[PDB]
Amino acid sequence: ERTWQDERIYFIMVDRFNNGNPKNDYEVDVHDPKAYHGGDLQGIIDKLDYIKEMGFTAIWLTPIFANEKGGYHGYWIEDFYKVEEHFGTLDDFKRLVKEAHKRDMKVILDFVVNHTGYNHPWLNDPAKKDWFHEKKDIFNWANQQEVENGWLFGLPDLAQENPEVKTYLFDVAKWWIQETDIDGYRLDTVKHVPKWFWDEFAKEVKSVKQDFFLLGEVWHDDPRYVAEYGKHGIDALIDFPFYKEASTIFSNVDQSLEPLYNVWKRNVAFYERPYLLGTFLDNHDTVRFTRLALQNRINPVTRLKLGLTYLFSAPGIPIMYYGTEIALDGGEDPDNRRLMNFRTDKELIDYVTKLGELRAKLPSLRRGDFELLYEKDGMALFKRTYEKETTVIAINNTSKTQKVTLDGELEQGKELRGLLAGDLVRSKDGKYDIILDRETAEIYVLAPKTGL
Ligand SMILES: OC[C@H]1O[C@H](O[C@H]2[C@H](O)[C@@H](O)[C@@H](O)O[C@@H]2CO)[C@H](O)[C@@H](O)[C@@H]1O
Ligand SMILES: [Ca+2]
Ligand SMILES: [Ca+2]
Ligand SMILES: [Ca+2]
Ligand SMILES: [Ca+2]
């Protein structure tokens, strides 16, 4: 049976992905980094086979609801019940969904309950005076009240305490599910909205579709803070603690992988569903992983191979930001949202393809436990077991050839067959000598000894 633990998510910012219809390019200026660039829903449909062939099983779209002027990213909503006209029509969205489901892919929409756009009509409506919290900045971030009540970046902060507001938000959450048959929501700005609302919200959306999937964006690096939202009806959480370590570690050579293993232990300790954590190297709110490599004056492709191998072999739900597969450069927002280029070399596309194939094929990578066998200054060995399958993941994030001998940590008398790069390690006198050249990786399955 397919569960969310088994999924791999491709993450698309609609306006910056693929312009499949030039006729809806109304305010487009591709030479203005703050304008619409013209990517749309037709462009997504056009690339569903591309996405599926890399092995992704689900797409998360940035919000598609009608935005005010300048809202190319979707987060400045003007009408919760309408598709943004740059992106297409409702009919186009239903067809995207249908086309995704025909290829056995799930669709998650980015969903906003915390705020409206700066210029939403409700702000000039006296009958909606009490739909918004008092207009003030958040200054004390350690006061969770203030975090929940204040206007984030000056965004009008909806007052969920008002039952009219709460009801409008529940109804529109249900409406999209009923109308379009989407598979889940990625919930924006979760920590800015009180926990009691999340419990009710989850009950409401699952009343329409019992298996509806919620993925919460809780922007924080302390997994104790993040984990609490798991207890209020949100199935899965975005793993910022993972990202903080993975982005750093993999964007330069000779750096220890051990912090990632501590992320995992802490995940098991704090979260009720520690495999339902969204893993990533970068996203729409971060400097591009490629750019971190470039800052380090080091080849981004080799960095990406190492980081992606970890992402696709460690616990959680990998989430790959569009463009990762082409080492798309970019600095801080908005430069980390460049239009996708489909006319590049295929080296990383093919690599991702193999990683997604292996994670599909090896249940230990989706469901196994996760042990650390060895880690030294960037040379790492991990082991994963599920029922009768044992895999070993070897990542040499060092600048030299490394030989690491296991002696006891695996059952004697077998061989490790390298499924990513064809390596072969045979038990010799009960020991396995794993040799990796600098900056390479391998994923082995343990299996019986073969021979000529
Ligand atoms: O105008 C503020 C800001 O809004 C958006 O930031 C998003 C961010 O992208 C999301 O992942 C999430 O945390 O919520 C924020 C607002 O809903 C835009 O993406 C950003 O460019 C813009 O500056
Ligand atoms: Ca367009
Ligand atoms: Ca608009
Ligand atoms: Ca709020
Ligand atoms: Ca060590």
Numbering used by the authors: 26 to 477
What did the authors write?
α-Amylases (EC 3.2.1.1) cleave α-1,4-glycosidic bonds of carbohydrates and oligosaccharides; Hence, these amylolytic enzymes are employed for industrial starch liquefaction and saccharification. GH13 family enzymes have three structural domains: (i) domain A, which forms an N-terminal (β/α)8 fold (TIM barrel) that functions as the catalytic domain; (ii) domain B, which is essential for substrate binding; and (iii) domain C, which forms a β-sandwich designated as a putative saccharide binding site6. Here, we present the first α-amylase structure from Anoxybacillus in the unaffiliated GH13 subfamily. The overall structure resembles previously solved structures of GH13 α-amylases13 and consists of three domains: catalytic domain A containing the active site within its TIM barrel fold (residues 26–139, 187–393), domain B (residues 140–186), and domain C with an all-β fold (residues 394–475).
TASKA-M was obtained through co-crystallization of TASKA and maltose, while TASKA-T represents TASKA in a post-maltotriose hydrolysis stage. We hypothesize that TASKA-M mimics the enzyme-product complex, while TASKA-T is a snapshot structure of the enzyme after maltotriose hydrolysis (post-substrate-hydrolysis stage). In the absence of a substrate or product, the structure of TASKA-Apo reveals that the active site of the enzyme is occupied by water and solvent molecules, whereas the structures of TASKA-M and TASKA-T show maltose bound to substrate-interacting subsites −1 and −2 of the substrate binding site with each subsite able to interact with one glucose subunit of maltose. In both the TASKA-M and TASKA-T structures, the maltose coordinates the βC-βD, βE-η3, βF-η6, βI-α11, and η8-α13 loops near the entry site of the TIM barrel and forms hydrogen bonds with the side chains of the Asp-Glu-Asp catalytic triad residues (D213, E242, and D310) and W101, Y143, R211, H309, and R362. The subsite −1 ring forms a π-π interaction with the side chain of conserved Y100, which is common to the GH13 family. Comparison of the Ca2+ ion binding sites of all three TASKA structures reveals that the side-chain of residue E110, which interacts with Ca3, underwent a conformational change in the TASKA-M structure relative to TASKA-Apo and TASKA-T. Two water molecules exclusively found in TASKA-M interact directly with Ca3 and bridge it with E52 and E110. Notably, E52 is not involved directly or indirectly in Ca3 binding in TASKA-Apo and TASKA-T, whereas a conformational change flips the main-chain peptide of Y51 to allow the side chain of E52 to interact with Ca3 in TASKA-M. The cause of this conformational change remains unclear. Structural comparisons also reveal that the carboxylic group of E110, which directly interacts with Ca3 in TASKA-Apo and TASKA-T, adopts different side-chain rotamers and interacts with a Ca3-binding water molecule in the TASKA-M structure.
